Amino acid sequence: IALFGALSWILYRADGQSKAHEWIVDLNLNVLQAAWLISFSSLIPFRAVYFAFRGMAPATASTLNGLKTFSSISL
Amino acid sequence: MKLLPESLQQEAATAAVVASWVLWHLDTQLLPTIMREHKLHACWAAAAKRYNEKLFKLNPSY
Amino acid sequence: VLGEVYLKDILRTPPTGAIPANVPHPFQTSFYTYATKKLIPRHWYLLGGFTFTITLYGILDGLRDSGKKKAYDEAIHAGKTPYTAGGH
Amino acid sequence: NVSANFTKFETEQLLQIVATFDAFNHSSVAFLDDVADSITYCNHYLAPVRAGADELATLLTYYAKNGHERADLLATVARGFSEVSLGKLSAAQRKDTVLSALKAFQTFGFYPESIEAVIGAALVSPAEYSAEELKEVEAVKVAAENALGGEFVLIQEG
Amino acid sequence: TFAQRLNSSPAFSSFLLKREKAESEVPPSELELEAAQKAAELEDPEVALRTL
Amino acid sequence: SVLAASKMVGAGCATIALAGVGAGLGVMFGSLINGAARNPNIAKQLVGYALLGFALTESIALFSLLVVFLILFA
Amino acid sequence: SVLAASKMVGAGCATIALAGVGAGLGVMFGSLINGAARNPNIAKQLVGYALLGFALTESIALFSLLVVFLILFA
Amino acid sequence: SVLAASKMVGAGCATIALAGVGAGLGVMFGSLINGAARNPNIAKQLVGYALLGFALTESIALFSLLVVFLILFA
Amino acid sequence: SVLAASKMVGAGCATIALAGVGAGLGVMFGSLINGAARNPNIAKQLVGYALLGFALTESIALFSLLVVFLILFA
Amino acid sequence: EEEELWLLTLTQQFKHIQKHFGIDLPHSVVAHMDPLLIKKIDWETTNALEDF
Amino acid sequence: MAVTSFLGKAFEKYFYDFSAYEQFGLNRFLSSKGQYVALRHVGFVMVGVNVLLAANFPFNPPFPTIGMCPAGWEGTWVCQADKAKALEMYKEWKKS
Amino acid sequence: SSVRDVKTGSLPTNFLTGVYRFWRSQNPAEKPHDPVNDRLLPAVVDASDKRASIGTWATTFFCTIISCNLLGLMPFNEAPTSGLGFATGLGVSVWATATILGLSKTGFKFPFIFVPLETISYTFRAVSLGVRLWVNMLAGHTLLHILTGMALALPFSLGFFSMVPATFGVCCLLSALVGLEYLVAVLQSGVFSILSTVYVGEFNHDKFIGPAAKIVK
Amino acid sequence: MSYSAYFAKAGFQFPAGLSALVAGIVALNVCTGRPTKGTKEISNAEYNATPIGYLQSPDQHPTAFPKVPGMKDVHGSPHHH
């Protein structure tokens, strides 16, 4: 449903862009935006971005420090 | 160029419906999950010293 | 000794047979609980702000439509066509 | 049912259940222990703050009339007594709530810090109280002064 | 180790992180590595019994 | 026509405003050089601040440019 | 018409004012860089002050832009 | 008409003055950043002074805007 | 014609904006000299920052020049 | 062996949480192992004290 | 061949292992990989503009032209500033 | 009735945790005079009850505006915020939320020349917060329209693949302006929600109840 | 061993109330209370008397890739006012 609706939306939007007055301007705006999507795929350090997002939440910025072994030793 | 919409109220109600859905989905779906994951870590980090001391006192093993 | 019954619903080990279903929050369970417990008493300022903007923009749409109606009647009374011709 | 599923019950529900179990006299040692365990350990420690001081006073006199004493439950339910929670009550209701809470705290001999909010709620408006009730409030005030190791002061705006 | 457990996590099976390694961001300390080795030596419970 | 002629005049008077936009941008980048020379150990951070200010000040530029298009083709 | 033609001229002369708005905004962001370089331990706070000033100074920008719309479509 | 056309031209030339108002406001907020970086222990007080100056300088802005309304609808 | 004549007038009023662009560029290069004299051990880095600001401020210049071509040949 | 079950259950549960938290631990396994902690955090979220 | 799994693996080996910067030996001409990304960005924009103009080139431009003309049309519908004139001339041109 | 299972440490959860904790840190709670203990805990909970949910509201507006702003940079899509009524409705709604909060603090009805001047500059927040988002989303888009029109005008008239340096320069400028549009999109969502925090937090001050009776020493 | 395969078992899923958001946006787009963007409500006598080509007007049917800007797909009614 997601990819069918996305392709449906892209075809509907491209058909509406072609019927517009400066239609070729819109069709090359699509190229201008897809170029920066392609450049984002190349430029972004995705591992550094993942580990930087891990530092935004305090639950993943640190190791879970809680119960120690020496307090819970059973004998 | 398009400046003025066909309906200002329909577009403002679209903004209100989208922001109210984002508010509901934040408060109801995202924030409970975020607070569970955050507050487990935060409660263990805030309670590590007192918890280990109380468990050390209650432990008869030593 | 301390048996299972002393930690029956308090402490459980990691599951060994199957992974359970996730425990829902009360807001995920019910929209009425979220509406009466958090949405109204904490977010009624936002709800009133959205209500104010929808009301004000309905007023502005009424002003725009009354201006269009006045220009339409002024064109009809003057014997002019109210709009100009289309391109085709 | 409450004793079997005490971990699943909320303080918001247990106060309403204990009020009915207090209305007519009905109690068990296991029921009082499970309600106290559920309010103290199975629920949030700020749940008496969201309770309303009349329900906490009813639960306190329930545990006082049954003679069952739990110091941890006493600390937890004592945390709910405040200037905010007693200020939400009407004056005729606040009189009964303050008197019953002070009677329960004097029965148990437990004097937390938050009893300053209860005794103060009597001494800010002493005109509604009788002379007998003012005498019992002064007795609880003297006992709480000795237990907390200081002198009770009324605090004005500053 | 923590980086080894991160490598087996679903997020390093996602498309943008298939070829990345968790050791490249923060490398494991040698106490972590020798602790992983020492824990691997003790996953046999009989060996842990005999050692203790 | 008088209308399209005044559209050209109003477009030129509209894009007058890029002068003060470029002047403020030059002042900001000169202060970027001064801040990087005063304390270079945060210079990368300062560059980020500069680009932040740059984008925000260029918003004013596009504001003026919007008016030019609203005179030229609207 | 003379009216819509002068509307274009008045719109351009109206959006002249974005020059000094962008100049003051560039001065403020340059002083943001200078203040962050002088004492970075409050730099985040300074950024907040800058954005505060930014919003307030851009109010003047929208004031000028309001007049452009009052000439163009009012 | 010539009158309403010149009303649009005079309105644009009237709201020219928001340029120098925004420039002075940007200068004042930049000096707010500089003063908060020089001595932050009074920074809250400085913000109050800045807002004081802001309101007073924006009085000049509304003065110019008053003239725009006196040309547009008076 | 009135149209091409007003195109010349609007082109001149359009390229007015290079004044403030050149003024900000001169301010930035003067601060480049001041920063290189204050701390020359990062001077090459400062030159890079200057050229960065130069290109970005020039963008405003080409913005104005774009409008000149949009009046002259569009 | 009088209270060994409680101490070893505490050790087992926290050891599994600390091994898997922030990497691949499901929220269902968390809510299964410690239902009362999840109940208290859900009380905090329900009573508009999520930023407490 | 599962329709999406093979597509995922093929796109993965195109995305990661295939690199035209190395296979065409562009380190000789270019300083960086990021300079190649910038040049490939603007080259993608230029290739897209040219193929969108080549897909339909005889049309009258909606965008304002800079006093110019395509090839030998000169005074046809393609070089008409008046769009109604261009539509009626397009009909006579289409007659052939 | 069955909720989905969530992995701990997911990238959307971590990003949204950092975003919410950023917007919550904009209007922090006031440190009370007394040491916070079980005596002061109901006053602290009551003070949190009096405070508005500006963290949740700012996170809502930040997410819903950075999504609509980044929609305009996706191919075949336009920004909903580039429409006038959408962005200005968000701004007027934020101003009305702050005004309704301030009216609820003062008793539900509205308060020489100083009173008109400050009321005009306060009412201008309603216009300004939405219009500064709307014309900024119209900004790089309409400049992009005109510039890619001239970028089409060069090879339409000089040949499809000839004079590549001039069209190369114009496409470099176009690429730089779409990147600037990305920066302006993220930054305008951030500026909107910073301003929503500072507008709603003007009326976020209620007095601490505190203890009316203590036992000193 | 990990929980990675357990999370790989779950497919793609929409956000939990996305049907309400879609059904709010669509209901705002279809409950306008006004005609549909270049149409006009007419009498039933006119609507049954009018053919299909005269009901269509050329501004609401622009050409997909127009060789001249302003080309329309239909010519509308040949009868002109």
Ligand SMILES: [Zn+2]
């Ligand atoms: Zn567009």
